[PDB]
Structures are given as structure tokens and as C-alpha cells.
């Protein structure tokens, strides 16, 4: 849930 | 102080965030010098990119926001829990903040309608109801509407 | 009880109002039996008519809503202060309630942005600022953006 | 202000 989102924002940040 | 000073960091951060959140709430515009404006434009592009991440969009919608502050701090904490940093993460965080604003509204507005309904029906009940009864209730308005 | 009963009056009133307010907040849909649906449709038409009363629209925007509840009760009281009633007035009142909802948002949203900014910049200040300083502040993001 | 609106809603209600 909330935890899903954090992991996605992290994946996205790192890819950038 | 220059760019490295906490003051500038906080100030420019506030301008970038505000501009970014106000910019996102499209689907008073903020004062920015030139370099800040360039940063703001790049941020908007990225926000626009992330809006197309449909799964992310699906999960923000699904988020239990009984406590949007709890949501923000749990997410912010989880994003950086590994001790790493990069600009991608700061931006992804700023993005999330702007989405939380839209999401928070998604809860305040039922509440607000309910609140205003509360005043209206309270008023109706104590002041109009007698007269409405004299019309035979709302079937009277049906009649009024020809 | 029939239509004249206070229960039906309050119930149907709540459905009509809710449907009306939710219907207006276009610029979860409400459960309605047939006759209520007919009334709801006529109400929407009138709301649409009033939206074109541009001066009225100008004045609702200009309204000091530091206290939207105060606004509602002052207006409701003033509308009916002469002791007269008619369906036109009840409808005009319902219309105003729906406009107050939109208007209330016009105040909550700056507040909300400000609130969320508060969390974000608090978090940034206590957790990210060190790293941002290592980049030479936000001029670093300018660099990051090629 | 607030008072302007009440008078207008009243005028409008009555005309209906």
C-alpha cells in the first residue's frame, strides 16, 4: 500500500 | 549565503515545491528568478512523465489516507531508509507531495459536502420545514415544476 | 409517513441536496427513486441557469469566507427575514449551499498545499538538507538536469 | 457582500 509507493518512488528516483 | 547555505536551500526548496504542487494541481502562481524558473520547468516535465505511470497512479488512489501526514512521513521515511540519496529521489518525493495534495482533497470534499449539507438541512429543519409541510412536502415542488 | 411527514421531508431533502451539490461540483452519485429523480433533474437545470448569472457568480467569489458557516447562516437568515416562503427561495438556497462548497474549497486548498509543504520541507530540512549541501544546493539539480 | 447575495437569491426565488 503506502509501502508499495515508497518502493516505486525509490526505483524511479534511482533510474533518473 | 550562497546556494549551499541552508537558508537558500530552504527558500529555493519552498519555491520549487510550491511551484511544483500548484503546477500539478491543473488536472496564485509563484515568484521565481531565472535559474529557479529553469529548474521549475524541468520538474514539471518529470511530474508529467510520472502522471503517465499508470500503476503508480492506481496505487496512490488506493492509498488509505485516513492520516495523510502519516502517509507522507511513512513514504518519505521508506524512500530513504537505505541511507542513499540522489536528485531522482528528491524529485520523486516532491512529486509524491503534490499527489498527496490531490489525494487529501479526495477526502476533504466528501466531508465538506457533508458539512455544508449539515448546515442546510439544520436550517431547513428548524426554519422551512413548517412551510414545506404546508405544501404537502417535496411533492409540492414536483407540482410547482408544472 | 407520507410526503408531508418531517421524516420524508428531511430524507428527500437530504437526497435532493446531496444530488444537487454533487451535481454542481462538475465545473459517488446518489440513490434516487423515480419522483426524486424528476425533481433532481429540474434542480440541475435551475442551477445551470443561475451559474450564468454572472454578477451573482462575481459576488460569491468576492465573499469573505473566513467563516463559511457564518456566511451560510447569515445568508439563509437574510433570505427569509421577511417571513415569506416559496419554492423559488428554497431552490435559491440550495443553490447557494452548493456554491459554498466550491467556495469553501477555494480556501481549504491553499491551506492544504501549505500543510503538505510543511511536512515536505520539514522532512527535507531534517533529513535531506545535508546531502543537498554536499551538492552545492539546488544549483546541483540544475547540473543534474544536464 | 454576504448581504448582497441574500438579496439576490431572494429576488431570484421570488421571480421563479
Residue numbers in the entry:
A (entry chain B), D (entry chain B): 144 to 159
B (entry chain A), C (entry chain A): 11 to 37, 48 to 166
Publication excerpt:
We previously showed that mini-BH3 motifs, 20-mers spanning residues ‘h0'–‘h4', sufficed to trigger dissociation of BaxΔC into core and latch domains. These structures are essentially identical to that reported above and to BidBH3:BaxΔC21 (PDB 4BD27), except to note that in the case of the BimBH3mini complex, no clear density is evident for F159 (the ‘h4' residue). Note also that the conformation of F30 in the BimBH3mini:BaxΔC26 complex resembles that found in all of the BidBH3 complexes with Bax that we have studied, further suggesting that the altered orientation of this residue in the BimBH3:BaxΔC26 structure stems from the different crystallisation conditions.
Unlike Bak, which is constitutively anchored in the mitochondrial outer membrane (MOM) via its C-terminal segment, Bax is largely cytosolic in healthy cells and accumulates at the MOM only upon a death signal. Core/latch dimers of Bax and Bak form on treatment of the monomeric proteins with certain BH3 peptides and CHAPS, and Bax and Bak core domains form symmetric homodimers, supporting that unlatching the core domain is a necessary step to Bax and Bak oligomerisation and permeabilisation of the MOM.
